[PDB]
Ligand binder design. Structure first.
Ligand SMILES: CCc1cc(C(=O)NC)c2nccc(N3CCc4c(cc(Cn5ccnc5)cc4-c4cn(C)nc4C(F)(F)F)C3=O)c2c1
Length: 305
C-alpha cells in the first residue's frame, strides 16, 4: 500500500473529563479507555458500542493496559496505586501500593505474570500479578517517568523520562543495561519497542518522533510535522496493512507516517482538543484516538489498507 484511507466510523462519548489512554484488547474484541474522571470504560472494538464502566480509583487514571489473554486490565492512577481488574466481572483483584506519587504509565509483560509501572516519583516498579507485591524498585530516572514497555519476550523493559533519558533494563536482575541520550536532551515523552523487538520508537518534546536501533545506538528514522511540545502522547506501529507510524498531536489531529519513507500519508481531522492517545487494532486496520478535556471523546477510524 502507498497510503491508507482511514475514515471516521464511530465517536464514543461518555467520559466526563479528559480521556487519558485507549488500548485494544489483544483478542481484538474490545477497547479500554481511562480518564481523568477516575473511570475505566469498555467499548466494542468494531462497532464502538459502550459495554461497561469499571470504577474504584479515588483519583484520575493516566493509563490502562491489557493482559495477554484479554481477561485482565491494569490501571495507573493519581491515587498512587495501580489496580488489577477482572474485566468480565468488574472486580478489583489487587491494589498495587508502593509508589509515592502519581502512577503515570503501565504495561503487562507478554507472559502477563508481571506488571511494570512508571511514576512521578521517578521510579520504575516491577510487580507480581498473582500476589500484587512489588518485586523490584528501579531508581530509573531523575524526573517523572513518561513510559514503560516490555519487549516481545519480556526479558527487557524500556523506560523514558522528562530527564531526557531512555533506559533499557534487564527484567530478571533489574540492572540498567543501557542509557540512551539525544542532542540537547529534550524530555523523552514516550517510548515503546517495535513488534519485532529490535527497535524503539521514541517521542521527544521538540515535535519529533524517532525510530532507534537501541543495540547500536543509531537513529534510523525521524518523523516530524506534528505538534508535540508539552504532552506525553502515545505513538504506535501500525502493521495490519501498510507499515505506518501513528501518533496524536497537540493540533488536534491524528498523524500517520510511512515508516520507511517518513512522509506523512494521512492526517485525521475530527477531534476538538489535543489527541493524547492513539492505538492500533491487532488484526484489522482500525485506529482508536482520544482527546483532552475540551473534547473528551474517543474515535474509531477504519481503513482499507
Ligand atoms: C511524565 C509525567 C508528566 C510530566 C510532566 C512534566 O513533568 N512537565 C514538566 C507533564 N507536564 C505536562 C503535562 C503532562 N501530562 C499530564 C496529564 C497526562 C499526560 C499524558 C497522558 C497520556 N499518557 C498516559 C500515559 N502515557 C501517556 C495522560 C495524562 C492524564 C492523566 N490524567 C489523570 N488525566 C490526564 C489527561 F491529560 F488526560 F487529562 C501528560 O502529558 C505531564 C506528565
Amino acid at each position: 500500500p502507498v497510503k491508507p484511507n482511514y475514515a471516521l466510523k464511530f465517536t464514543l462519548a461518555g467520559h466526563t473529563k479528559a480521556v487519558s489512554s485507549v488500548k485494544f484488547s489483544p483478542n481484538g474484541e474490545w477497547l479500554a479507555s481511562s480518564s481523568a474522571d477516575k473511570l475505566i470504560k469498555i467499548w466494542g472494538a468494531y462497532d464502538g458500542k459502550f459495554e461497561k464502566t469499571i470504577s474504584g480509583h479515588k483519583l484520575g487514571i493516566s493509563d490502562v493496559a491489557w493482559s495477554s489473554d484479554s481477561n485482565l486490565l491494569v490501571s495507573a492512577s493519581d491515587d498512587k496505586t495501580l489496580k488489577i481488574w477482572d474485566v468480565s466481572s468488574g472486580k478489583c483483584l489487587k491494589t498495587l501500593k508502593g509508589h509515592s506519587n502519581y502512577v503515570f504509565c503501565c504495561n503487562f509483560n507478554p507472559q502477563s505474570n508481571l506488571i511494570v509501572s512508571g511514576s512521578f516519583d521517578e521510579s520504575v516498579r516491577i510487580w507480581d500479578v498473582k500476589t500484587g507485591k512489588c518485586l523490584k524498585t528501579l531508581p530509573a530516572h531523575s524526573d517523572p517517568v513518561s513510559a514503560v514497555h516490555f519487549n516481545r519476550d519480556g526479558s527487557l523493559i524500556v523506560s523514558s523520562s522528562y530527564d531526557g533519558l531512555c533506559r533499557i533494563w534487564d527484567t530478571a536482575s533489574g540492572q540498567c543495561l543501557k542509557t540512551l541520550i539525544d542532542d540537547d536532551n529534550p524530555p523523552v515523552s514516550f517510548v515503546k519497542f517495535s513488534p519485532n523487538g529490535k527497535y524503539i520508537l521514541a517521542a521527544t518534546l521538540d515535535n519529533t518522533l524517532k525510530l532507534w536501533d537501541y543495540s547500536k545506538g543509531k537513529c534510523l528514522k525521524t518523523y516530524t510535522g506534528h505538534k508535540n511540545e508539552k504532552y506525553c502522547i502515545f505513538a504506535n506501529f501500525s502493521v495490519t496493512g501498510g507499515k505506518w507510524i501513528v501518533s496524536g498531536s497537540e493540533d488536534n489531529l491524528v498523524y500517520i507516517w510511512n515508516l520507511q519513507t517518513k512522509e506523512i500519508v494521512q492526517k485525521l481531522q475530527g477531534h476538538t482538543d489535543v489527541v493524547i492517545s492513539t492505538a492500533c487494532h491487532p488484526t484489522e486496520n482500525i485506529i482508536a484516538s482520544a482527546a483532552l478535556e475540551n473534547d473528551k471523546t474517543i474515535k474509531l477510524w477504519k481503513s482499507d489498507c
